Design a protein around this motif. Structure first.
Motif, short mmCIF file in Angstrom:
data_model
loop_
_atom_site.label_atom_id
_atom_site.label_comp_id
_atom_site.label_asym_id
_atom_site.label_seq_id
_atom_site.Cartn_x
_atom_site.Cartn_y
_atom_site.Cartn_z
N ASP A 1 28.22 33.24 50.92
CA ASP A 1 27.43 32.03 51.12
C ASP A 1 26.46 31.83 49.95
O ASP A 1 26.53 30.83 49.23
CB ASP A 1 26.64 32.11 52.43
CG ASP A 1 27.51 31.97 53.67
OD1 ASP A 1 28.72 31.65 53.52
OD2 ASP A 1 26.95 32.17 54.79
N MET A 2 25.55 32.80 49.76
CA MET A 2 24.59 32.77 48.65
C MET A 2 25.24 32.34 47.36
O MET A 2 24.74 31.46 46.65
CB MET A 2 23.95 34.15 48.48
CG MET A 2 23.06 34.24 47.27
SD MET A 2 22.44 35.89 46.86
CE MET A 2 23.77 36.61 45.90
N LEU A 3 26.36 32.96 47.01
CA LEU A 3 27.05 32.53 45.81
C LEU A 3 27.43 31.07 45.92
O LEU A 3 26.99 30.25 45.12
CB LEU A 3 28.26 33.41 45.53
CG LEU A 3 27.88 34.89 45.36
CD1 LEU A 3 29.00 35.66 44.68
CD2 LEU A 3 26.58 35.02 44.58
N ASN B 1 26.93 25.26 44.30
CA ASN B 1 26.68 23.85 44.56
C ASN B 1 25.43 23.35 43.85
O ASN B 1 25.36 22.17 43.49
CB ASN B 1 26.59 23.60 46.06
CG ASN B 1 27.97 23.58 46.74
OD1 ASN B 1 28.95 23.12 46.15
ND2 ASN B 1 28.04 24.12 47.96
N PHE B 2 24.45 24.23 43.63
CA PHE B 2 23.29 23.79 42.88
C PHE B 2 23.60 23.68 41.39
O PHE B 2 23.03 22.83 40.70
CB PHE B 2 22.12 24.71 43.15
CG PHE B 2 21.01 24.62 42.13
CD1 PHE B 2 21.10 25.31 40.93
CD2 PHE B 2 19.91 23.80 42.35
CE1 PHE B 2 20.08 25.22 39.98
CE2 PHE B 2 18.89 23.70 41.40
CZ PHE B 2 18.98 24.40 40.21
N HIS C 1 30.68 25.02 34.60
CA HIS C 1 31.31 26.33 34.41
C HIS C 1 30.53 27.43 35.13
O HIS C 1 31.14 28.38 35.65
CB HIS C 1 31.43 26.62 32.92
CG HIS C 1 32.28 25.62 32.19
ND1 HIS C 1 33.64 25.50 32.41
CD2 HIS C 1 31.97 24.70 31.25
CE1 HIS C 1 34.12 24.55 31.63
NE2 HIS C 1 33.13 24.04 30.92
N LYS C 2 29.22 27.32 35.20
CA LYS C 2 28.46 28.31 36.01
C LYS C 2 28.85 28.08 37.48
O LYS C 2 28.99 29.08 38.20
CB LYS C 2 26.95 28.21 35.78
CG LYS C 2 26.52 28.32 34.32
CD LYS C 2 25.06 28.68 34.14
CE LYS C 2 24.50 28.26 32.80
NZ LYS C 2 25.44 28.52 31.69
N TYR C 3 29.02 26.83 37.89
CA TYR C 3 29.52 26.60 39.24
C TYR C 3 30.84 27.33 39.47
O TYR C 3 30.98 28.12 40.41
CB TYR C 3 29.64 25.10 39.47
CG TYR C 3 30.69 24.70 40.46
CD1 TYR C 3 30.46 24.80 41.82
CD2 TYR C 3 31.90 24.17 40.04
CE1 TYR C 3 31.40 24.42 42.74
CE2 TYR C 3 32.87 23.78 40.94
CZ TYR C 3 32.61 23.91 42.30
OH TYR C 3 33.56 23.54 43.23
#
Ligand SMILES: Nc1nc2c(ncn2[C@@H]2O[C@H](COP(=O)(O)CP(=O)(O)OP(=O)(O)O)[C@@H](O)[C@H]2O)c(=O)[nH]1
Ligand SMILES: [Mn+2]
Ligand SMILES: [Mn+2]
Ligand code: NA
Length: 320
Positions: free
Chosen positions: A8-10, A15-16, A25-27
């Motif tokens: 979840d945390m990830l 999404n942020f 790409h960080k997403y």
DNA sequence: CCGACCCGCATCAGC
DNA sequence: GCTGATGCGA
DNA sequence: GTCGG
């Protein structure tokens, strides 16, 4: 369970990154580490432990520590409170509002569905549908409805031309007990990669589905792709079935299978299989798989799998 | 230290 | 008008 | 963010 706390945390961190940071790409990196940690079989008890996995680097390993140690991610905490970022993130949930418009809207103080409704002029066509069906489009559609949805499409398409071939692909083709949209693949003999022996082939199908009051609104309509809204016919003095998304693709008959593999997905799986074609020395897209050289021949979905040394994964197992 | 990371349609920027 | 870039979502 | 040149 299933390292659900981390995943979840990830996912939330992801999404942020897309919606607020516009860091695509960080997403992907976050969702990735998430899908991997999800397959790991063990309860992760340490950032370092997770760091052994591929896709998990230091930063995510740092975050797993703060989470395991405090049952909380102080960054995430700050982000959820933050009026601006909470809104930009929310508005993304309206189809037609990506991160870029989300931020325009919040800059001008538009931050809620209520604020959107009384700003209809500031919405392009797509975003106006996205608001008008914000509820329905987030509702899941039961397979029982997918079937009702399938009958109508197959029935109406053949009513146009008995030579068309229509295949509901997507979560549906993967046995999923429920789906988000209706993804549909369309082929006709006139349209081939070599030639376009007939025009309006997509149009005809769309107008017919629109003639029979199945397709209720259009989001985008080209020669070969349709994005739209559709609705099961209801009964007498009976509730109205929710409004549902539908995507129609017109693929050249010759590349039918490269289109099935693609529109069946999944998206995580698709990028997982595309990223393995590159390292095995290949390029796989919805039309072709190339060596980028000439089109390799294809007359099965498994054909593509052997090309990259992949055991065939039945559509039901491509749920990555 | 640094660059890479898997296409169709609408709208917009600019000529 | 036109092209090309960008946003958005498959 | 993560990974590999
Ligand atoms: N290579 C890629 N293929 C994608 C991507 N997004 C969607 N697709 C392909 O389209 C197919 C359907 O698009 P969707 O957005 O509806 C995802 P899916 O059908 O698998 O699940 P549901 O939304 O729950 O119905 C998906 O399986 C695949 C993507 O980002 N990359
Ligand atoms: Mn789908
Ligand atoms: Mn779709
Ligand atoms: Na959106």
């Amino acid at each position: 369970t299933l390292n659900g706390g981390i995943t979840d945390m990830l996912t939330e961190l992801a999404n942020f990154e897309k919606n607020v940071s516009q860091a695509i790409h960080k997403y992907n990196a976050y969702r990735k580490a998430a899908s991997v940690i999800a397959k790991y079989p063990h309860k992760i008890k340490s950032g370092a432990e997770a760091k052994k996995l591929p896709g998990v680097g230091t930063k995510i390993a740092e975050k797993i520590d703060e989470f395991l140690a405090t049952g909380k991610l102080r960054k995430l905490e700050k982000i959820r409170q933050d009026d601006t970022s909470s809104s930009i993130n929310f508005l993304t949930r309206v189809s037609g509002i990506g991160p870029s418009a989300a931020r325009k809207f919040v800059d001008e103080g538009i931050k809620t569905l209520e604020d959107l409704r009384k700003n209809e002029d500031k919405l392009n066509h797509h975003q106006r549908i996205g608001l008008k069906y914000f509820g329905d489009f987030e509702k899941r559609i039961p397979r029982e409805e997918m079937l009702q949805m399938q009958d109508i499409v197959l029935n109406e398409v053949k009513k146009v031309d008995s030579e068309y071939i229509a295949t509901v692909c997507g979560s549906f083709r993967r046995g999923a007990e429920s789906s988000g949209d209706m993804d549909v693949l369309l082929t006709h003999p006139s349209f081939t990669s070599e030639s376009t022996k007939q025009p309006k082939l997509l149009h005809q199908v769309v107008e017919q589905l629109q003639k029979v009051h199945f397709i209720t609104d259009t989001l985008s309509k080209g020669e070969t792709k349709f994005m739209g809204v559709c609705q099961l016919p209801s009964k007498n003095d009976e509730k109205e079935y929710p409004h549902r998304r539908i995507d129609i693709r017109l693929i050249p008959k010759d590349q039918y299978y490269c289109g099935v593999l693609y529109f069946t997905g999944s998206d995580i799986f698709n990028k997982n299989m595309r990223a393995h074609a590159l390292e095995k020395g290949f390029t796989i897209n919805e039309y072709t798989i190339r060596p980028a050289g000439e089109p390799l021949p294809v007359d099965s979905e498994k054909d593509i799998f052997d090309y990259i040394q992949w055991k065939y994964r039945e559509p039901k197992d491509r749920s990555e």
